[PDB]
């Protein structure tokens, strides 16, 4: 057959690992969609059916964009009385939830609980990365690379070094928003300062939830900064420079990694 | 005949194994069908007999050689030639039984085992589970000779099954899972011998069902979760394509896309 595709009921996690939430669980038309700490209960307002017809539904109503301009908010609304083009979203494999008529993406321009969701111009930013799951906590992996060495954080600095099975400094949290976080300061994010070659990648505050803080583990084993289209690179195949950078893709072993859990 | 990809354990390096597993992958599927960033093996329906299999020739620094046939539609070993004698796993099905006769044409004579090449049967003939059969360039070397001498009558049955369990994971399962390829690569890196951890067992147990869940997935999210294991025994579920993209490299074709 053609692949049936099903209608999974699922949470949607995003910025700083919080959930897509109908505010206060009031399903009146026009009420806002917010970021809220992911619950562990049955409450329908963080549970979303991904319908065959490209609608995302909670309790019966449709996730709906208030409009088609950047910055306008997203509401729960009756699926039949709403504008059909405002109820349709594509969930992408690189983590972005886009509204086709608008070409704008479900966004969380702030990281605090209660933040109102918006649609913004897509810049593959951490504020715009989502994932549908009932798995509330992030994926904690070591990240093995060149010469079988491990990605390691030490305060702001990050480099690869010999893999020690203890070392918490080598544990990483892959967040639903596409950020890669040091296990010991989940407030902080694997970060590129610039969209240019040989940008040295650091650990900084996730505060900005920026394009340079979003990553995707790809099928060829690279790790891609979506906005820049560059990938993680052990600079010059030299661990001892203690510098992981951004570099156009060529696929040699200094750009291949693997999430070993 | 069919494409043949060559590997050797003599001076086998991290390069030599890495380039081997790619070559096998690039010969299993054309890379034409890809679902949510993961390549799909060919569909058996519509695939002609002449492009049904590929062969991998394995040799030692004892210079023994042995040719294994993989079924391109599932990347799994169906049998092996060794000099002038071929041996085949018990085909689960008659149309498989006919595709089988199209391989190793010239062999002095064929043999078909009574048992299939699936882990459950294969472990009980070896008398030990995957959890306890070490893998690495060493074990593969031993396994290559054990397959060669079965023709001679020097390899006892539990050792032949044990040798099969080694080759299937370090060839087929590694070709399916970059994850598993990396676990083998780690062993070649430090020249260690090591039975697979629970994470590796589980992926290979889950391959068929992961192939189904990704291909029937709506937009990446699964209808039902799939349970996996960390390198400790501890458990955790996957609901979505996204973490699998770096972990699975080939899928068995299960349906057509829209």
């Amino acid at each position, epitope marked *: 057959d053609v692949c049936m595709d099903p209608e999974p009921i699922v949470r949607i996690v995003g910025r700083n690992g919080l959930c897509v939430d109908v505010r206060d669980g009031r399903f009146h038309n026009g009420n806002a969609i917010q970021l809220w700490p992911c619950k562990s209960n049955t409450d329908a307002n963080q549970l979303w059916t991904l319908k065959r017809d490209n609608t995302i539904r909670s309790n019966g109503k449709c996730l709906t964009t208030y409009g088609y301009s950047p910055g306008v908010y997203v509401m729960i609304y009756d699926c039949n009385t709403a504008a059909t083009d405002a109820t349709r979203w594509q969930i992408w494999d690189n983590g972005t939830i886009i509204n086709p008529r608008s070409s704008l993406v479900l966004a969380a321009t702030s990281g605090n609980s209660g933040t109102t969701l918006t649609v913004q111009t897509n810049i593959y930013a951490v504020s715009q990365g989502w994932l549908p799951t009932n798995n509330t906590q992030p994926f904690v992996t070591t990240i093995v690379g060149l*010469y079988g060495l491990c990605l390691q954080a030490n305060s702001g600095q990050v480099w690869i070094e010999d893999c020690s099975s203890e070392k918490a400094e080598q544990q990483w949290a892959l967040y639903a928003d596409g950020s890669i976080r040091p296990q010991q300061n989940r407030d902080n994010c694997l970060t590129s300062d610039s969209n240019i070659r*040989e940008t040295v990648v650091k650990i900084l505050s996730c505060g900005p939830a920026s394009s340079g803080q979003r990553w995707m583990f790809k099928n060829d084993g690279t790790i891609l900064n979506l906005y820049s289209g560059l990938v993680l690179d052990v600079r*010059a*195949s*030299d661990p001892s420079l203690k510098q992981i950078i951004l*570099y156009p893709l060529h696929g040699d072993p200094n750009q291949i990694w693997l999430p070993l859990f | 005949q069919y494409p043949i990809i060559n590997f050797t354990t003599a001076g086998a*390096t991290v*390069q030599s194994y890495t380039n081997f597993i790619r070559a096998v992958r690039g010969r299993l599927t054309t890379g034409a069908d890809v679902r949510h960033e993961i390549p799909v093996l060919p569909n058996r329906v519509g695939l002609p007999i002449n492009q049904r299999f590929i062969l991998v020739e394995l040799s030692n620094h004892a210079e023994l050689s042995v040719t294994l046939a993989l079924d391109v539609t599932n990347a799994y070993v169906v049998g092996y030639r060794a000099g002038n004698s071929a041996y085949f796993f018990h085909p689960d099905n008659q149309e498989d039984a006919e595709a089988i006769t199209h391989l190793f044409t010239d062999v002095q004579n064929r043999y078909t085992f009574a048992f299939g090449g699936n882990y459950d049967r294969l472990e009980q003939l070896a008398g030990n589970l995957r959890e306890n059969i070490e893998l690495g360039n060493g074990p593969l070397e031993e396994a290559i000779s054990a397959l060669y001498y079965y023709s001679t009558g020097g390899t006892q049955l539990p050792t032949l099954a044990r040798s099969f369990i080694i080759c299937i994971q370090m060839i087929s399962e590694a070709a399916r899972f970059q994850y598993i390829e990396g676990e083998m690569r780690t062993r070649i890196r430090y020249n260690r011998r090591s039975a697979p951890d629970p994470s590796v067992i589980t992926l290979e147990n889950s391959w068929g069902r992961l192939s189904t869940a990704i291909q029937e997935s709506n937009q990446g999210a699964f209808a039902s979760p799939i349970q996996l294991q960390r390198r400790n025994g501890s458990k955790f579920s996957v609901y979505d394509v996204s973490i699998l993209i770096p972990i699975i490299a080939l899928m068995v074709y299960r349906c057509a896309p829209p």
Partner: nanobody
Amino acid sequence: QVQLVETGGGLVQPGGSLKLSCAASSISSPNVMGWYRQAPGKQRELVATMTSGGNTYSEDSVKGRFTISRDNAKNTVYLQMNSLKPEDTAVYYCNARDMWDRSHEYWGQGTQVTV
């Protein structure tokens, strides 16, 4: 096992130009071959190295001024250098390492560029 012989160390005033050469004795297939440099008292620093497949990593301070070519035929790397600053004054080491084994890394023993 592999050995690297260097050339081109010189004696220059600000604004000159210096080219450095390096020959090698084959190395594993995806590799890099380039130049490092160390002025006494300070630590060793990459200046430029090229990949097996023609891509190069270089240091910000030196880009534009410095050109790095290879030919791979039998293991050559060249470093071309203009707008010479008294800051480009160090011992320059030619380097070659592959990308599969950490061990397989090889150095010359430097040429003193004085500028």
